[PDB]
């Protein structure tokens, strides 16, 4: 075992030195020239109001208007961004739910929690009402995460520090994705759905094929958990939030850490992030009750977003109208 | 709303609305527990008195037309850090320690100073059950002993408002004040503990009654300044 | 990432010092615990503070073993004392999140762990 643990540490050398050499010069050096954005002013527009208990989740949808939501009082909802209506109302068999998925063509929902199923949801039925089409069961820990690929294809992420990708019409795994230490607690998808990310608890992100099945890149430089990942517009970098109150910036083809955003006035833990339509913002919740956003290329404080308890989740919307946030005094508001 | 669909529409969310009405005053009057204990302990059997890889399991019992739900984590990992934080909204917590094993103790003691003293649990009042007395009974009058594990156990003696062998209640009591102790030595007065001295019982019910009713008198009366 | 590093056969009623010696992360943010392990289930030995304020231990060892670390140099230390027949390996350990009281460090790979090393009081 000793002989193994010294290759594996002269390979690990063989990475560092080799990122080292092709770290060269910063982003800061050559984003410096660059006029500020400034200030950004955002107000508040809607309010929507029916959620019982604190939210966890909510997804826009592919059309821009509607959008669903999840509670822990056992309730999904799906609403009316515009005239704030309410379009469905679902009850859950389990009220310890985490995490909601809204489908690309806009026919199915799903969600999942501590009770390691995620069940789908069939929203055009020929009866007027909503009903369960398929429960996914095999997992060991408690779901954190699920995003559809298309009507038939989901992606799911587990407390037992593994993912999974399913097959609805037959509900068995068809690919598992091991190689995680802690539980895996969020993942993103790629615009040309072939590859995507994930955080976990051992402070690592990782990159997976989803064709082949195998880990290709492993990132590195934060100190605690991992809470959320976005990744980028244009499909090479994306960006982290952690427990120790900062944001990265990680590459793909230079597989390295890029500008950190950080500050000193604050030490609680980043619950979300999301990006603009262009990239050129990027914005994040934290637990003191607030909501930042940041210049994603000279990590200035530009603007605040300020709810009563702590922010669990965001949206930015795909024509990058509008901006949603969740909390957890159990209302939904809408920036623009 | 200047269309005849779009009236028809707001119908619809209003009805919603209304059953959302319905649903709530149905959840504003439950109160909900959360269960925690070793594999050691009897808390598998203090369920089925009060009586497929699922994540959660889930109990109903009702005692004075009052309502309780009490939930059970079922097949789950040793990593306790992250789904700790979606209970803390509940009543109460049930702890359950088994005190007739004289070795995984410390263990029983860690795990309740990590929990009392958690971000997110604050507020929140534990009720410790004291498990397996008839063991603990049946071991200390045939003499495994409790001076090698716990070295200040040579002096200690009982106090004088203790309610009860007199070797029996001196080690009772001796485990009742090291958790006590434990739970006293923070909190700043927002939670508190209730010990029990529970055996294999037909009032552990009206015992959770009890106490929960206590820790919300006292949240009243520490909401309106009468305290 | 972060990695932890410990350093560390005895005739009885000798004493010894084993260290940790840890990069990567800030150390002076940190809890910092030593667990060890019979050849039986890890149990936890003696919890120091940030700043060292406050120092606890386990019955079996209170009185005979002493644990300090120093800022300066992200290391942290138990002096090891007046063994007696004591054969685990004894890792390091550090919580989860920095600022905070609480803290839950498993037998499953807590990965801020240290490998750790063997002791041997035994002849």
């Known amino acids: 075992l000793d002989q193994l643990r010294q290759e594996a540490e002269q390979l690990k050398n063989q990475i560092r030195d080799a990122r080292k050499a092709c770290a060269d010069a910063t982003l800061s050096q050559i984003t410096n020239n660059i006029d500020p954005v400034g200030r950004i002013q955002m107000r508040t527009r809607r309010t929507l109001r029916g959620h019982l208990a604190k939210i966890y989740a909510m997804h826009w949808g592919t059309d821009s208007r509607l959008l669903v939501s999840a509670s822990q009082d056992g309730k999904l909802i799906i609403w009316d961004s515009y005239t704030t209506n309410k379009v469905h109302a679902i009850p859950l068999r389990s009220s310890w739910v985490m995490t909601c998925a809204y489908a690309p063509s806009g026919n199915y929902v799903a969600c999942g929690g501590l009770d390691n199923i995620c069940s789908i949801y069939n929203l055009k039925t020929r009866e007027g009402n909503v009903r369960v089409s398929r429960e996914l069961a095999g997992h060991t820990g408690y779901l954190s995460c699920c995003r559809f690929l298309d009507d038939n294809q989901i992606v799911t992420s587990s407390g037992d520090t593994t993912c999974a990708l399913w097959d609805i019409e037959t509900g068995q795994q068809t690919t598992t994705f091991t190689g995680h230490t802690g539980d895996v607690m969020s993942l993103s998808l790629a615009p040309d759905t072939r590859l995507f990310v994930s955080g976990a608890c051992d402070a690592s992100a990782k990159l997976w094929d989803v064709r082949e099945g195998m880990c290709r890149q492993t990132f590195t430089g934060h100190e605690s958990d991992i809470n959320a990942i976005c990744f980028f517009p244009n499909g090479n970098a994306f960006a982290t939030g952690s427990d120790d109150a900062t944001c990265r910036l990680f590459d793909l083809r230079a597989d390295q850490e890029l500008m950190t955003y950080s500050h000193d006035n604050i030490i609680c833990g980043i619950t979300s992030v999301s990006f603009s339509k262009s990239g050129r913002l990027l914005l994040a919740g934290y637990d003191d009750f607030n909501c930042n956003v940041w210049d994603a290329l000279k990590a200035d404080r530009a603007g605040v977003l300020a709810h009563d308890n702590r922010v669990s989740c965001l949206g930015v919307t795909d024509d990058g109208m509008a901006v949603a946030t969740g909390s957890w005094d159990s209302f939904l508001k809408i920036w623009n | 709303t200047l269309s005849a669909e779009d009236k028809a529409a707001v119908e619809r969310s209003k009805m919603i609305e209304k059953q959302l009405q319905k649903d709530k005053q149905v959840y504003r009057a439950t109160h909900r527990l959360l269960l925690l204990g070793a594999d050691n302990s009897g808390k598998s059997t203090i369920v089925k008195q009060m009586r497929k890889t699922s994540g959660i399991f889930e109990t109903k019992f009702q005692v004075d037309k009052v309502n309780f739900h009490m939930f059970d984590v079922g097949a789950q990992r040793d990593e306790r850090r992250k789904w700790i934080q979606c209970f803390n909204d509940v009543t109460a917590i049930i702890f359950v320690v088994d005190s007739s094993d004289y070795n995984r103790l410390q263990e029983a003691l860690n795990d309740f100073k990590s929990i009392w003293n958690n971000r997110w649990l604050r507020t929140i009042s534990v009720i410790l059950f004291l498990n397996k007395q008839d063991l603990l009974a049946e071991k200390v009058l045939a003499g495994s002993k409790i001076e090698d594990y716990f070295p200040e156990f040579a002096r200690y003696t009982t106090p004088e408002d203790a309610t009860p062998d007199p070797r029996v209640t001196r080690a009772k009591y001796f485990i009742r004040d090291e958790f006590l102790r434990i739970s006293t030595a923070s909190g700043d007065g927002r939670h508190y503990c209730y010990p029990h001295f529970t055996c294999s019982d037909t009032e552990n019910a009206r015992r959770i009654f009890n106490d929960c009713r206590d820790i919300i008198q006292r949240m009243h009366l520490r909401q309106y300044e009468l305290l | 990432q972060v990695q932890l590093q410990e350093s560390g056969l005895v005739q009885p009623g000798g004493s010894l010092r084993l260290s940790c010696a840890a990069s990567g992360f800030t150390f002076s943010n940190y809890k910092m615990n030593w667990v060890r392990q019979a050849p039986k289930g890890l149990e936890w030995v003696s919890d120091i503070s940030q700043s060292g304020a406050s120092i606890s231990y386990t019955g079996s060892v209170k009185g005979r073993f002493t644990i300090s670390r120093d800022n300066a140099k992200n290391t942290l230390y138990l002096q090891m004392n007046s063994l007696k027949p004591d054969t685990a390996v004894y890792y390091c350990?550090?919580?989860?999140?920095?600022?905070?009281?609480?803290?839950?460090?498993?037998?499953?790979?807590?990965?801020?762990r240290g490998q750790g090393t063997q002791v041997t009081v035994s002849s």
């Open positions: 350990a550090r919580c989860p999140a920095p600022f905070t009281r609480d803290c839950f460090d498993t037998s499953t790979t807590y990965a801020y």
